[PDB]
Amino acid sequence: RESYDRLARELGGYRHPWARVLSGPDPELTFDLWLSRLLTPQTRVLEAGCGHGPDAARFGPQAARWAAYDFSPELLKLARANAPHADVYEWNGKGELPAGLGAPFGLIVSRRGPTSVILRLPELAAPDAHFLYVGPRLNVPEVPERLAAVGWDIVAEDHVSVLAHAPTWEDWQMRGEFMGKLARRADWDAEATVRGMPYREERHLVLARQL
Ligand SMILES: [Cl-]
C-alpha cells in the first residue's frame, strides 16, 4: 500500500533507508554519550527536526523541558504520543518562532536534522547554552561556517567512520539512489563479498557554545 511507504519514509526520515550491517561500533554512540552528559533536571531543551519523537521519548524525561519541532503534522501526532512530556511544535524552521516555543534554551540539539537553526541561536539560546549536532556524513561544512557566523565556538568535534556492508544488490542500489550516485552492477559483480558491498558509515559530531 501507499499508506505504508509514506509511513516508512516518515519514520525513516532521519536514517539511511537501505539494509546494512555494521562491522564496527555504531558511529552515533558518541553523540548519545555527549547528549546524555549534557542533560540535567534543570535543562531546557530545544530539538530541531524531532520526527516521530524517538529522542524526545528516550532523552526527554531527563530534562526539565524538551521542546521539539518538525514539519509533518501527522508525524507530530506520533511524536506527541511517543513523548507525553515533550512540547511538540509544527514548524518549517523559517520566519518567526512558533508562538509558545519557550526560549531561551540551555541546549539546542539536532540529530541529522536542520542546520539552519544555528542561525537562530541568538534568539533561542540562554547564555552558556550548548548546541549539539550529528550529521550523516564525515564532514558537514555548513555547521562550522554557520556557527562562526553567529560567533559561537566549537568545543568538541568528531569525524567518525565505520565499515558497513549493504547485504544485497537491491540494498546497494537503494543506497546509490539516496546518495545520488547510481549503483552499477559492475562494481557489485566485482567487489561484493559474501558480506555484500562494503562502504563507510560516516558522521560529523559538533558540540558548540558561545564562550
Ligand atoms: Cl523509534
PDB file of C-alpha atoms and ligand atoms in Angstrom:
ATOM      1  CA  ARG A   1       0.000   0.000   0.000  1.00  0.00           C
ATOM      2  CA  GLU A   2       0.994   3.645  -0.468  1.00  0.00           C
ATOM      3  CA  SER A   3      -0.035   4.392   3.110  1.00  0.00           C
ATOM      4  CA  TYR A   4       2.864   2.161   4.175  1.00  0.00           C
ATOM      5  CA  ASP A   5       5.503   3.829   2.003  1.00  0.00           C
ATOM      6  CA  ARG A   6       4.588   7.263   3.381  1.00  0.00           C
ATOM      7  CA  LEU A   7       4.720   5.947   6.940  1.00  0.00           C
ATOM      8  CA  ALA A   8       8.076   4.304   6.197  1.00  0.00           C
ATOM      9  CA  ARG A   9       9.522   7.411   4.533  1.00  0.00           C
ATOM     10  CA  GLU A  10       8.335   9.365   7.551  1.00  0.00           C
ATOM     11  CA  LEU A  11       9.538   7.139  10.401  1.00  0.00           C
ATOM     12  CA  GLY A  12      12.753   6.689   8.404  1.00  0.00           C
ATOM     13  CA  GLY A  13      13.295  10.359   7.545  1.00  0.00           C
ATOM     14  CA  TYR A  14      16.500  10.708   9.604  1.00  0.00           C
ATOM     15  CA  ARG A  15      18.039   7.301   8.784  1.00  0.00           C
ATOM     16  CA  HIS A  16      19.626   5.538   5.824  1.00  0.00           C
ATOM     17  CA  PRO A  17      16.792   3.537   4.077  1.00  0.00           C
ATOM     18  CA  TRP A  18      18.795   0.500   2.954  1.00  0.00           C
ATOM     19  CA  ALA A  19      19.593  -2.663   4.917  1.00  0.00           C
ATOM     20  CA  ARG A  20      23.126  -2.572   6.365  1.00  0.00           C
ATOM     21  CA  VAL A  21      25.286  -4.432   8.891  1.00  0.00           C
ATOM     22  CA  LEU A  22      27.941  -2.513  10.859  1.00  0.00           C
ATOM     23  CA  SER A  23      31.369  -4.163  11.110  1.00  0.00           C
ATOM     24  CA  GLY A  24      32.239  -1.811  13.972  1.00  0.00           C
ATOM     25  CA  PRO A  25      30.584   0.317  16.734  1.00  0.00           C
ATOM     26  CA  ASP A  26      27.555   2.425  15.721  1.00  0.00           C
ATOM     27  CA  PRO A  27      29.012   5.774  14.671  1.00  0.00           C
ATOM     28  CA  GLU A  28      26.373   7.695  16.673  1.00  0.00           C
ATOM     29  CA  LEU A  29      27.250   6.156  20.061  1.00  0.00           C
ATOM     30  CA  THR A  30      29.455   9.148  20.913  1.00  0.00           C
ATOM     31  CA  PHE A  31      26.624  11.541  20.147  1.00  0.00           C
ATOM     32  CA  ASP A  32      24.349   9.649  22.565  1.00  0.00           C
ATOM     33  CA  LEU A  33      27.031   9.786  25.258  1.00  0.00           C
ATOM     34  CA  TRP A  34      27.629  13.519  24.763  1.00  0.00           C
ATOM     35  CA  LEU A  35      23.900  14.243  24.801  1.00  0.00           C
ATOM     36  CA  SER A  36      23.369  12.224  27.960  1.00  0.00           C
ATOM     37  CA  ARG A  37      26.179  14.110  29.776  1.00  0.00           C
ATOM     38  CA  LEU A  38      24.546  17.447  28.879  1.00  0.00           C
ATOM     39  CA  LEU A  39      21.081  16.713  30.338  1.00  0.00           C
ATOM     40  CA  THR A  40      20.093  17.685  33.890  1.00  0.00           C
ATOM     41  CA  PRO A  41      16.694  18.117  35.601  1.00  0.00           C
ATOM     42  CA  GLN A  42      17.239  21.871  35.139  1.00  0.00           C
ATOM     43  CA  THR A  43      17.995  21.749  31.374  1.00  0.00           C
ATOM     44  CA  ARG A  44      15.582  23.340  28.879  1.00  0.00           C
ATOM     45  CA  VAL A  45      15.980  21.564  25.555  1.00  0.00           C
ATOM     46  CA  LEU A  46      15.015  22.502  22.015  1.00  0.00           C
ATOM     47  CA  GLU A  47      15.225  19.694  19.459  1.00  0.00           C
ATOM     48  CA  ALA A  48      15.198  20.601  15.774  1.00  0.00           C
ATOM     49  CA  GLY A  49      13.604  18.034  13.461  1.00  0.00           C
ATOM     50  CA  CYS A  50      12.141  15.643  16.043  1.00  0.00           C
ATOM     51  CA  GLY A  51      10.409  13.349  13.553  1.00  0.00           C
ATOM     52  CA  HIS A  52       8.223  10.849  15.452  1.00  0.00           C
ATOM     53  CA  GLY A  53       9.916  11.697  18.776  1.00  0.00           C
ATOM     54  CA  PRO A  54      12.467   8.956  19.287  1.00  0.00           C
ATOM     55  CA  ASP A  55      14.891  11.270  21.084  1.00  0.00           C
ATOM     56  CA  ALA A  56      12.155  13.202  22.860  1.00  0.00           C
ATOM     57  CA  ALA A  57      10.930   9.887  24.256  1.00  0.00           C
ATOM     58  CA  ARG A  58      14.307   8.493  25.088  1.00  0.00           C
ATOM     59  CA  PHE A  59      16.187  11.554  26.496  1.00  0.00           C
ATOM     60  CA  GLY A  60      13.303  13.930  27.148  1.00  0.00           C
ATOM     61  CA  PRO A  61      12.424  12.801  30.669  1.00  0.00           C
ATOM     62  CA  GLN A  62      15.990  13.577  31.792  1.00  0.00           C
ATOM     63  CA  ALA A  63      15.494  17.290  31.077  1.00  0.00           C
ATOM     64  CA  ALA A  64      13.381  19.980  32.773  1.00  0.00           C
ATOM     65  CA  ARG A  65      11.620  20.570  29.454  1.00  0.00           C
ATOM     66  CA  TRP A  66      12.058  19.037  25.988  1.00  0.00           C
ATOM     67  CA  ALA A  67      10.615  21.296  23.310  1.00  0.00           C
ATOM     68  CA  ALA A  68      10.739  19.809  19.802  1.00  0.00           C
ATOM     69  CA  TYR A  69       9.611  20.648  16.263  1.00  0.00           C
ATOM     70  CA  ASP A  70       9.143  19.232  12.809  1.00  0.00           C
ATOM     71  CA  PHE A  71       7.170  19.962   9.636  1.00  0.00           C
ATOM     72  CA  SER A  72       4.827  16.980   9.097  1.00  0.00           C
ATOM     73  CA  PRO A  73       1.575  17.339  11.106  1.00  0.00           C
ATOM     74  CA  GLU A  74       0.753  13.624  11.117  1.00  0.00           C
ATOM     75  CA  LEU A  75       4.294  12.688  12.100  1.00  0.00           C
ATOM     76  CA  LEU A  76       3.983  15.134  15.005  1.00  0.00           C
ATOM     77  CA  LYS A  77       0.903  13.201  16.197  1.00  0.00           C
ATOM     78  CA  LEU A  78       3.161  10.158  16.701  1.00  0.00           C
ATOM     79  CA  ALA A  79       5.742  12.325  18.407  1.00  0.00           C
ATOM     80  CA  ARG A  80       3.207  13.654  20.936  1.00  0.00           C
ATOM     81  CA  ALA A  81       2.051  10.095  21.750  1.00  0.00           C
ATOM     82  CA  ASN A  82       5.640   8.785  21.833  1.00  0.00           C
ATOM     83  CA  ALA A  83       6.680  11.513  24.282  1.00  0.00           C
ATOM     84  CA  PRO A  84       3.849  12.889  26.505  1.00  0.00           C
ATOM     85  CA  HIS A  85       6.284  15.037  28.473  1.00  0.00           C
ATOM     86  CA  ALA A  86       7.510  16.804  25.317  1.00  0.00           C
ATOM     87  CA  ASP A  87       6.218  20.081  23.916  1.00  0.00           C
ATOM     88  CA  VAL A  88       5.906  19.495  20.163  1.00  0.00           C
ATOM     89  CA  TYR A  89       5.521  22.245  17.552  1.00  0.00           C
ATOM     90  CA  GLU A  90       4.752  22.301  13.828  1.00  0.00           C
ATOM     91  CA  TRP A  91       7.386  24.458  12.182  1.00  0.00           C
ATOM     92  CA  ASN A  92       9.426  24.566   8.983  1.00  0.00           C
ATOM     93  CA  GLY A  93      12.228  26.355  10.824  1.00  0.00           C
ATOM     94  CA  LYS A  94      11.639  29.631   8.925  1.00  0.00           C
ATOM     95  CA  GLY A  95      10.205  33.048   9.692  1.00  0.00           C
ATOM     96  CA  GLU A  96       9.045  33.852  13.215  1.00  0.00           C
ATOM     97  CA  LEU A  97       9.371  31.348  16.046  1.00  0.00           C
ATOM     98  CA  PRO A  98       6.268  29.290  16.821  1.00  0.00           C
ATOM     99  CA  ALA A  99       4.127  31.009  19.404  1.00  0.00           C
ATOM    100  CA  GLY A 100       4.741  29.481  22.803  1.00  0.00           C
ATOM    101  CA  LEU A 101       8.087  27.917  21.860  1.00  0.00           C
ATOM    102  CA  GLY A 102       9.504  28.956  25.221  1.00  0.00           C
ATOM    103  CA  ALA A 103      13.022  30.238  24.518  1.00  0.00           C
ATOM    104  CA  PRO A 104      15.586  30.633  25.943  1.00  0.00           C
ATOM    105  CA  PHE A 105      17.058  27.122  25.963  1.00  0.00           C
ATOM    106  CA  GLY A 106      20.172  25.656  27.591  1.00  0.00           C
ATOM    107  CA  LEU A 107      20.525  23.018  24.878  1.00  0.00           C
ATOM    108  CA  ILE A 108      19.671  23.029  21.178  1.00  0.00           C
ATOM    109  CA  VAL A 109      20.064  19.599  19.691  1.00  0.00           C
ATOM    110  CA  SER A 110      19.762  18.100  16.205  1.00  0.00           C
ATOM    111  CA  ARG A 111      20.327  14.506  15.177  1.00  0.00           C
ATOM    112  CA  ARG A 112      20.872  14.742  11.407  1.00  0.00           C
ATOM    113  CA  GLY A 113      18.240  17.465  11.408  1.00  0.00           C
ATOM    114  CA  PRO A 114      18.087  21.115  10.268  1.00  0.00           C
ATOM    115  CA  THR A 115      21.296  23.143  10.454  1.00  0.00           C
ATOM    116  CA  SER A 116      19.641  26.471   9.667  1.00  0.00           C
ATOM    117  CA  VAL A 117      18.575  26.531  13.313  1.00  0.00           C
ATOM    118  CA  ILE A 118      22.190  27.557  14.026  1.00  0.00           C
ATOM    119  CA  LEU A 119      21.457  30.978  12.575  1.00  0.00           C
ATOM    120  CA  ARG A 120      18.590  31.408  15.067  1.00  0.00           C
ATOM    121  CA  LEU A 121      20.803  30.622  18.102  1.00  0.00           C
ATOM    122  CA  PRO A 122      20.980  34.297  19.147  1.00  0.00           C
ATOM    123  CA  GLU A 123      17.166  34.186  19.503  1.00  0.00           C
ATOM    124  CA  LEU A 124      16.969  30.705  21.044  1.00  0.00           C
ATOM    125  CA  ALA A 125      19.905  30.246  23.417  1.00  0.00           C
ATOM    126  CA  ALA A 126      20.272  31.163  27.068  1.00  0.00           C
ATOM    127  CA  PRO A 127      23.787  32.317  27.999  1.00  0.00           C
ATOM    128  CA  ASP A 128      26.119  29.316  28.294  1.00  0.00           C
ATOM    129  CA  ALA A 129      23.776  27.170  26.183  1.00  0.00           C
ATOM    130  CA  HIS A 130      25.260  24.345  24.088  1.00  0.00           C
ATOM    131  CA  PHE A 131      24.382  23.393  20.517  1.00  0.00           C
ATOM    132  CA  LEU A 132      24.753  19.683  19.798  1.00  0.00           C
ATOM    133  CA  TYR A 133      24.654  18.156  16.289  1.00  0.00           C
ATOM    134  CA  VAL A 134      25.482  14.968  14.419  1.00  0.00           C
ATOM    135  CA  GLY A 135      25.461  14.974  10.612  1.00  0.00           C
ATOM    136  CA  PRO A 136      25.064  11.991   8.295  1.00  0.00           C
ATOM    137  CA  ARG A 137      28.445  12.459   6.552  1.00  0.00           C
ATOM    138  CA  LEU A 138      32.088  12.680   7.585  1.00  0.00           C
ATOM    139  CA  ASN A 139      32.080  16.476   7.327  1.00  0.00           C
ATOM    140  CA  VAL A 140      29.157  18.909   7.090  1.00  0.00           C
ATOM    141  CA  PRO A 141      30.908  22.225   6.243  1.00  0.00           C
ATOM    142  CA  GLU A 142      27.866  24.474   6.829  1.00  0.00           C
ATOM    143  CA  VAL A 143      27.745  23.697  10.542  1.00  0.00           C
ATOM    144  CA  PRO A 144      31.133  25.202  11.481  1.00  0.00           C
ATOM    145  CA  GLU A 145      30.531  28.055   8.971  1.00  0.00           C
ATOM    146  CA  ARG A 146      27.124  28.863  10.422  1.00  0.00           C
ATOM    147  CA  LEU A 147      28.418  28.661  13.990  1.00  0.00           C
ATOM    148  CA  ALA A 148      31.265  31.053  13.062  1.00  0.00           C
ATOM    149  CA  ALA A 149      28.674  33.373  11.535  1.00  0.00           C
ATOM    150  CA  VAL A 150      26.815  33.729  14.855  1.00  0.00           C
ATOM    151  CA  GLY A 151      30.007  33.970  16.916  1.00  0.00           C
ATOM    152  CA  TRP A 152      29.777  30.522  18.536  1.00  0.00           C
ATOM    153  CA  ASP A 153      32.775  28.346  19.485  1.00  0.00           C
ATOM    154  CA  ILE A 154      33.217  24.655  18.770  1.00  0.00           C
ATOM    155  CA  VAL A 155      34.179  22.894  21.994  1.00  0.00           C
ATOM    156  CA  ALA A 156      34.175  19.310  20.676  1.00  0.00           C
ATOM    157  CA  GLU A 157      34.247  17.787  17.230  1.00  0.00           C
ATOM    158  CA  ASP A 158      34.431  14.200  15.947  1.00  0.00           C
ATOM    159  CA  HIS A 159      34.833  12.827  12.418  1.00  0.00           C
ATOM    160  CA  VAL A 160      33.687   9.220  12.653  1.00  0.00           C
ATOM    161  CA  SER A 161      33.815   6.465  10.041  1.00  0.00           C
ATOM    162  CA  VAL A 162      32.721   2.822  10.391  1.00  0.00           C
ATOM    163  CA  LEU A 163      32.899  -0.061   7.914  1.00  0.00           C
ATOM    164  CA  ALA A 164      29.467  -1.366   6.917  1.00  0.00           C
ATOM    165  CA  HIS A 165      28.067  -3.672   4.219  1.00  0.00           C
ATOM    166  CA  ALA A 166      24.938  -3.459   2.098  1.00  0.00           C
ATOM    167  CA  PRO A 167      23.951  -7.147   2.144  1.00  0.00           C
ATOM    168  CA  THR A 168      22.345  -7.284  -1.320  1.00  0.00           C
ATOM    169  CA  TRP A 169      22.381  -5.678  -4.762  1.00  0.00           C
ATOM    170  CA  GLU A 170      18.958  -4.184  -4.045  1.00  0.00           C
ATOM    171  CA  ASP A 171      20.348  -2.582  -0.902  1.00  0.00           C
ATOM    172  CA  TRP A 172      23.393  -1.284  -2.784  1.00  0.00           C
ATOM    173  CA  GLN A 173      21.067   0.231  -5.402  1.00  0.00           C
ATOM    174  CA  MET A 174      18.891   1.883  -2.794  1.00  0.00           C
ATOM    175  CA  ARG A 175      21.969   3.470  -1.200  1.00  0.00           C
ATOM    176  CA  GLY A 176      23.006   4.690  -4.652  1.00  0.00           C
ATOM    177  CA  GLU A 177      19.675   6.475  -5.032  1.00  0.00           C
ATOM    178  CA  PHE A 178      19.813   8.039  -1.559  1.00  0.00           C
ATOM    179  CA  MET A 179      23.341   9.220  -2.343  1.00  0.00           C
ATOM    180  CA  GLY A 180      22.586  10.432  -5.870  1.00  0.00           C
ATOM    181  CA  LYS A 181      25.312   8.149  -7.210  1.00  0.00           C
ATOM    182  CA  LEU A 182      23.817   5.471  -9.459  1.00  0.00           C
ATOM    183  CA  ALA A 183      24.810   1.957  -8.412  1.00  0.00           C
ATOM    184  CA  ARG A 184      26.327  -0.159 -11.178  1.00  0.00           C
ATOM    185  CA  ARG A 185      26.138  -3.948 -11.379  1.00  0.00           C
ATOM    186  CA  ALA A 186      29.792  -3.929 -12.475  1.00  0.00           C
ATOM    187  CA  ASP A 187      31.021  -2.648  -9.112  1.00  0.00           C
ATOM    188  CA  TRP A 188      28.779  -5.133  -7.313  1.00  0.00           C
ATOM    189  CA  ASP A 189      29.824  -8.076  -9.512  1.00  0.00           C
ATOM    190  CA  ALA A 190      33.499  -7.281  -8.982  1.00  0.00           C
ATOM    191  CA  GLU A 191      33.711  -6.013  -5.415  1.00  0.00           C
ATOM    192  CA  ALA A 192      30.862  -7.572  -3.413  1.00  0.00           C
ATOM    193  CA  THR A 193      31.897 -10.264  -0.950  1.00  0.00           C
ATOM    194  CA  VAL A 194      29.799 -12.774   0.964  1.00  0.00           C
ATOM    195  CA  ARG A 195      29.042  -9.935   3.378  1.00  0.00           C
ATOM    196  CA  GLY A 196      27.817  -7.890   0.407  1.00  0.00           C
ATOM    197  CA  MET A 197      29.081  -4.466  -0.661  1.00  0.00           C
ATOM    198  CA  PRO A 198      31.496  -2.580   1.686  1.00  0.00           C
ATOM    199  CA  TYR A 199      31.200   1.167   2.364  1.00  0.00           C
ATOM    200  CA  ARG A 200      31.731   3.589   5.258  1.00  0.00           C
ATOM    201  CA  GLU A 201      29.023   4.905   7.534  1.00  0.00           C
ATOM    202  CA  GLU A 202      30.360   8.325   8.482  1.00  0.00           C
ATOM    203  CA  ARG A 203      29.265  11.009  10.946  1.00  0.00           C
ATOM    204  CA  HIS A 204      30.305  14.540  11.916  1.00  0.00           C
ATOM    205  CA  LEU A 205      29.668  15.404  15.580  1.00  0.00           C
ATOM    206  CA  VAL A 206      29.769  19.006  16.747  1.00  0.00           C
ATOM    207  CA  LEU A 207      29.290  20.467  20.209  1.00  0.00           C
ATOM    208  CA  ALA A 208      29.420  24.260  20.305  1.00  0.00           C
ATOM    209  CA  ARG A 209      28.783  27.087  22.738  1.00  0.00           C
ATOM    210  CA  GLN A 210      29.257  30.836  22.896  1.00  0.00           C
ATOM    211  CA  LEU A 211      32.247  31.407  25.164  1.00  0.00           C
TER     212      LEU A 211
HETATM  213 CL    CL B   1      11.926   4.794  17.183  1.00  0.00          CL
END
